[PDB]
């Protein structure tokens with residue numbers, strides 16, 4: 001007869017959420033974080049299979065709110081720009097006649113309170129017409145002042161995305177499938193496990209995904225519900241698509257001592273190649289990759305349907321255009337130049353017009369706003385487009401797709417789908433032929 | 439309502455108030471209980 | 482042969498029992514190594530939860546007179562209603578995950594007798610053997 005035998009160290013686990021913590025090397029917000037191991041360990045697990053589900057992966061939720069928390073903490077100790085909310089006296093800026101630049105900035109002046117709380121000083125600064133609005137030269141207002149206060153980001157702190165690793169506490173395991181195929185959820189024939197995750201950069205962007213990871217095999221299409229056009233579609237590329245964006249303005253920073261003590265960085269003068277900031281895209285590369293994407297689409301909609309690509313529905317600029325950070329500066333680009341195509345039934349280069357804003361609102365959050373300091377000198381950078389955030393638009397053939405975003409949990413999820421966290425249960429029992437003596 | 443059973447108890451106070459436009463102020467008003475306010479030194 | 486953490490997870494319960502310690506070590510792990518700040522109380526909380534997580538079950542093994550754990554026998558007989566399979570149908574043809582899939586239904590029920598029967602009776606008895 002068999003008896004109850006007690007076992008400990010049993011290799012079993014249940015899907016469970018706990019509090020994850022970071023790790024990264026030894027700028028943005030990361031210093032108070034445990035350095036990574038010089039030899040991150042892993043182990044493929046043979047005969048071990050189980051389901052993943054990226055759409056209920058609470059790792060995303062934590063990461064999201066943690067990044068937000070970091071953001072706020074990095075701003076509290078910086079200078080508040082409360083006394084900037086004043087009536088502005090502004091005029092057009094006579095760019096090289098006649099007018100290709102459309103101005104876009106105003107030579108605003110105003111009676112400003114200085115360190116000598118008492119006698120004020122008439123000063124001036126160049127502002128983008130996206131930041132200011134006419135009251136009622138003419139009178140203008142900082143747009144934020146009708147919604148909330150605004151804080152100047154410190155000139156020392158940066159916004160450069162840094163690779164972050166996530167680790168689980170003892171008793172919890174980081175599981176990672178290596179299956180090159182994945183529908184977004186279901187069993188994985190090839191499952192491994194790791195100490196911690198790979199370095200993920202906290203890149204904030206809409207519409208287009210930047211500097212992410214690459215997919216293997218073919219282009220990956222992932223969606224909570226492909227047939228439901230109330231949902232959206234994640235597209236992961238196989239090959240990095242280069243994009244090179246430039247701001248050809250060797251401008252200065254006429255910092256103004258609007259104390260007491262604390263200093264404000266206003267916009268000095270704009271000189272150099274007065275052209276609109278824009279992005280350069282390899283056209284043939286875009287066409288080629290887009291085609292590869294359409295192949296996938298064909299595979300989930302039929303071998304006799306029509307695929308069209310267009311821009312967004314419009315509205316809030318933050319959603320309408322492609323937003324991203326380069327070197328502290330915030331760009332808004334008209335991606336109509338990319339998302340304008342079509343496919344049937346079965347250099348060259350592209351220039352994307354961009355705009356610059358200085359007053360921005362993070363993560364759709366209202367109640368506060370952050371002032372970007374102007375960055376001195378010409379700003380230009382390059383990155384890898386590694387995926388798309390697409391939405392699905394008389395429904396028997398032609399379908400139209402367009403870029404979206406808004407919810408930045410989407411961005412984190414586009415990477416964390418490779419991971420899941422489980423809770424180990426060391427204690428188990430089993431029937432064994434054994435009668436225990438004294 | 440005349441004559442006076444309520445004893446007032448509130449005053450129709452007005453004042454030059456600083457607004458969102460730190461600069462040009464706005465004459466506003468508000469009803470306060472005489473338990474909240476006290477005479478300095480209409481009054 | 483050293484396999485690695487959970488290296489035997491994809492094997493039969495008999496096979497897996499070979500290397501329970503390789504797992505045991507990292508069940509508590511250890512090491513790890515402007516105030517507050519994000520992570521400031523998260524590494525705190527997590528590292529705490531690890532300790533609790535561990536001891537909560539370790540104490541049960543303390544109560545279930547074994548202590549010298551990973552494996553030990555009892556004097557509680559196995560009730561046939563708790564998944565009636567043969568040893569070769571169990572130990573030589575089933576993983577631990579597959580095992581739990583079934584037996585998990587009677588977890589607290591089995592714990593009842595483990596928490597008690599023997600622990601109660603093994604003692605008293607001894608106290609009586611100490612009479613002389």
Ligand SMILES: *[C@@H]1O[C@H](CO)[C@@H](O[C@@H]2O[C@H](CO)[C@@H](O[C@@H]3O[C@H](CO[C@H]4O[C@H](CO)[C@@H](O)[C@H](O)[C@@H]4O)[C@@H](O)[C@H](O[C@H]4O[C@H](CO)[C@@H](O)[C@H](O)[C@@H]4O)[C@@H]3O)[C@H](O)[C@H]2NC(C)=O)[C@H](O)[C@H]1NC(C)=O
Nearest residue numbers: 242243244245279280281282283347348349350381382383
């Ligand atoms: C997006 O931005 C990236 C940078 O971030 C730009 O990258 C350039 O891409 C091109 C194409 O891949 C590269 O051009 C090729 O470079 C080769 C080597 O250049 C260096 O070394 C040579 C000697 O070997 C020097 O003479 C030269 O000054 C460089 O220092 C050249 O061998 C190639 O020449 C051949 O192709 C060109 C046409 O492309 C022909 O004209 C030639 O006759 C010859 O056949 C070629 O120039 C370039 O080096 C990359 N730059 C860097 C920094 O890596 C992309 O250009 C950019 N896209 C947009 C639209 O601007």
Ligand SMILES: *[C@@H]1O[C@H](CO)[C@@H](O[C@@H]2O[C@H](CO)[C@@H](O[C@@H]3O[C@H](CO)[C@@H](O)[C@H](O)[C@@H]3O)[C@H](O)[C@H]2NC(C)=O)[C@H](O)[C@H]1NC(C)=O
Nearest residue numbers: 087088089090109110111112118119120121122123137139
């Ligand atoms: C801060 O800049 C504002 C303009 O943005 C200056 O406003 C000027 O303020 C004075 C005082 O209110 C005005 O002067 C008065 O004007 C009337 C009519 O012209 C005249 O009758 C009075 O004798 C007196 O001069 C002035 O008109 C007004 N300017 C405008 C454009 O409205 C203010 O002077 C600035 N402060 C600093 C310190 O320079």
Ligand SMILES: *[C@@H]1O[C@H](CO)[C@@H](O[C@@H]2O[C@H](CO)[C@@H](O[C@@H]3O[C@H](CO)[C@@H](O)[C@H](O)[C@@H]3O)[C@H](O)[C@H]2NC(C)=O)[C@H](O)[C@H]1NC(C)=O
Nearest residue numbers: 091092093094095106107108109110122123124125126269
């Ligand atoms: C933007 O508005 C500012 C004022 O807010 C204008 O500032 C003016 O800038 C010029 C160039 O720096 C200054 O002119 C120089 O002044 C000195 C002394 O008066 C003189 O020696 C030089 O020959 C020259 O004229 C001017 O004084 C300055 N004004 C003030 C109030 O400081 C600027 O012109 C505006 N830009 C636009 C396009 O209107």
Ligand SMILES: *[C@@H]1O[C@H](CO)[C@@H](O[C@@H]2O[C@H](CO)[C@@H](O[C@@H]3O[C@H](CO)[C@@H](O)[C@H](O)[C@@H]3O)[C@H](O)[C@H]2NC(C)=O)[C@H](O)[C@H]1NC(C)=O
Nearest residue numbers: 055184185223224225226227228229230231232392393395
């Ligand atoms: C993926 O999501 C889509 C939409 O979010 C789900 O589509 C829904 O599918 C059901 C079954 O075809 C539709 O229900 C039927 O609707 C008609 C009219 O309302 C009603 O007469 C029937 O009694 C029945 O409820 C439903 O309307 C349709 N929703 C929409 C937006 O078209 C689909 O079920 C989702 N798939 C997953 C696995 O959940």
Ligand SMILES: *[C@@H]1O[C@H](CO)[C@@H](O[C@@H]2O[C@H](CO)[C@@H](O[C@@H]3O[C@H](CO)[C@@H](O)[C@H](O)[C@@H]3O)[C@H](O)[C@H]2NC(C)=O)[C@H](O)[C@H]1NC(C)=O
Nearest residue numbers: 310311312313314315316317319320321333334335336340
């Ligand atoms: C994306 O590109 C499309 C064109 O491919 C742009 O379509 C434009 O959308 C707006 C909003 O639906 C239309 O404006 C409305 O037009 C009517 C009549 O002209 C007018 O009564 C309204 O006051 C309003 O302006 C506009 O006509 C339409 N253009 C065309 C060609 O149909 C859309 O604006 C683009 N989005 C981005 C962000 O640029």
Ligand SMILES: *[C@@H]1O[C@H](CO)[C@@H](O[C@@H]2O[C@H](CO)[C@@H](O[C@@H]3O[C@H](CO)[C@@H](O)[C@H](O)[C@@H]3O)[C@H](O)[C@H]2NC(C)=O)[C@H](O)[C@H]1NC(C)=O
Nearest residue numbers: 311317320321332333334335336337338340352353354355
């Ligand atoms: C994004 O860039 C596209 C061009 O690549 C811009 O397209 C322009 O969109 C507007 C709205 O659909 C078009 O305006 C409408 O045109 C008709 C005819 O000229 C006129 O009847 C309407 O009153 C209205 O102006 C405009 O023609 C179209 N441009 C071209 C080249 O097709 C769009 O404006 C850009 N968005 C950003 C934010 O700059």
Ligand SMILES: *[C@@H]1O[C@H](CO)[C@@H](O[C@@H]2O[C@H](CO)[C@@H](O[C@@H]3O[C@H](CO)[C@@H](O)[C@H](O)[C@@H]3O)[C@H](O)[C@H]2NC(C)=O)[C@H](O)[C@H]1NC(C)=O
Nearest residue numbers: 451452453454455456457461462463464465466467480481
């Ligand atoms: C805010 O409300 C106060 C009353 O609560 C207003 O006070 C008025 O302030 C002006 C300037 O100090 C006084 O005007 C001066 O009065 C003298 C004598 O009447 C006259 O000689 C001067 O030419 C000048 O008008 C005015 O008398 C004073 N009112 C009272 C009740 O003391 C002030 O105007 C208000 N501000 C706003 C923006 O309405």
Ligand SMILES: *[C@@H]1O[C@H](CO)[C@@H](O[C@@H]2O[C@H](CO)[C@@H](O[C@@H]3O[C@H](CO)[C@@H](O)[C@H](O)[C@@H]3O)[C@H](O)[C@H]2NC(C)=O)[C@H](O)[C@H]1NC(C)=O
Nearest residue numbers: 439448449450451452453454464465466467468469470480
């Ligand atoms: C309490 O004090 C406030 C001022 O702080 C007094 O406000 C006055 O309220 C009346 C009723 O809302 C306003 O009268 C109306 O004005 C319009 C335009 O002038 C006129 O079309 C109507 O026929 C009517 O008279 C009056 O303008 C407003 N005063 C101001 C400064 O806004 C209120 O009367 C005070 N209550 C007590 C009991 O005295």
Ligand SMILES: *[C@@H]1O[C@H](CO)[C@@H](O[C@@H]2O[C@H](CO)[C@@H](O[C@@H]3O[C@H](CO)[C@@H](O)[C@H](O)[C@@H]3O)[C@H](O)[C@H]2NC(C)=O)[C@H](O)[C@H]1NC(C)=O
Nearest residue numbers: 045046047048484487488489490491492493494496497576
């Ligand atoms: C992963 O699951 C596979 C089955 O899917 C297990 O395969 C077993 O692997 C061992 C080692 O290659 C084989 O054992 C050898 O078999 C020969 C003949 O029976 C015997 O001569 C050797 O002494 C040795 O036992 C075993 O037969 C093979 N099983 C089958 C079905 O082919 C592997 O054990 C699994 N790994 C885990 C960790 O459980």
Ligand SMILES: *[C@@H]1O[C@H](CO)[C@@H](O[C@@H]2O[C@H](CO)[C@@H](O)[C@H](O)[C@H]2NC(C)=O)[C@H](O)[C@H]1NC(C)=O
Nearest residue numbers: 090091092093094098099101102103104137138
């Ligand atoms: C500043 O220049 C702009 C053009 O760059 C002028 O814009 C005009 O503004 C009025 C009022 O909104 C409109 O009636 C005109 O149709 C606008 N013109 C165009 C080209 O859109 C504005 O008038 C200029 N200000 C100064 C003082 O001259």
Ligand SMILES: *[C@@H]1O[C@H](CO)[C@@H](O[C@@H]2O[C@H](CO)[C@@H](O)[C@H](O)[C@H]2NC(C)=O)[C@H](O)[C@H]1NC(C)=O
Nearest residue numbers: 131132133134141142143144145146147148316
């Ligand atoms: C706060 O100011 C903003 C502009 O800075 C106002 O926004 C306008 O809101 C109406 C209603 O949604 C739209 O018709 C306008 O197009 C918006 N303007 C812009 C710039 O988007 C808003 O009305 C202001 N609130 C207060 C109470 O005045």
Ligand SMILES: *[C@@H]1O[C@H](CO)[C@@H](O[C@@H]2O[C@H](CO)[C@@H](O)[C@H](O)[C@H]2NC(C)=O)[C@H](O)[C@H]1NC(C)=O
Nearest residue numbers: 210211212214238239240241242382383384385
């Ligand atoms: C763009 O992504 C590509 C991967 O497709 C990156 O390629 C690496 O490029 C460097 C420089 O040539 C090589 O050292 C690496 O070995 C390349 N990787 C592979 C996979 O071939 C490139 O680094 C990416 N750029 C950005 C800015 O991240």
Ligand SMILES: *[C@@H]1O[C@H](CO)[C@@H](O[C@@H]2O[C@H](CO)[C@@H](O)[C@H](O)[C@H]2NC(C)=O)[C@H](O)[C@H]1NC(C)=O
Nearest residue numbers: 218295297298299300301302303304305345346
């Ligand atoms: C669409 O038609 C293509 C052929 O034009 C079909 O392609 C097959 O796809 C499967 C999956 O990749 C392969 O197993 C076959 O070998 C492919 N056939 C050939 C000719 O390459 C695909 O099955 C079609 N889809 C529909 C729904 O019928």
Ligand SMILES: *[C@@H]1O[C@H](CO)[C@@H](O[C@@H]2O[C@H](CO)[C@@H](O)[C@H](O)[C@H]2NC(C)=O)[C@H](O)[C@H]1NC(C)=O
Nearest residue numbers: 287309310311334335336337338339340341342
């Ligand atoms: C959408 O892109 C197409 C090209 O893919 C653009 O097509 C141009 O359309 C106008 C109007 O019919 C013609 O004058 C051009 O010759 C067309 N170009 C070519 C390549 O055929 C169209 O302009 C684009 N729309 C947007 C808003 O940029």
Ligand SMILES: *[C@@H]1O[C@H](CO)[C@@H](O[C@@H]2O[C@H](CO)[C@@H](O)[C@H](O)[C@H]2NC(C)=O)[C@H](O)[C@H]1NC(C)=O
Nearest residue numbers: 557558559560561562563564586587590591594
């Ligand atoms: C084994 O445990 C089961 C319950 O898991 C016990 O089942 C009882 O069995 C008797 C006989 O069939 C019935 O009178 C009871 O009603 C059953 N209980 C329930 C919960 O269904 C069985 O008694 C146990 N055997 C041992 C030796 O204790």
Ligand SMILES: *[C@@H]1O[C@H](CO)[C@@H](O)[C@H](O)[C@H]1NC(C)=O
Nearest residue numbers: 283284286287288291341343
């Ligand atoms: C993209 O290339 C495909 C063929 O691969 C072609 O059908 C389409 O016209 C191309 N687009 C561009 C802009 O040339």
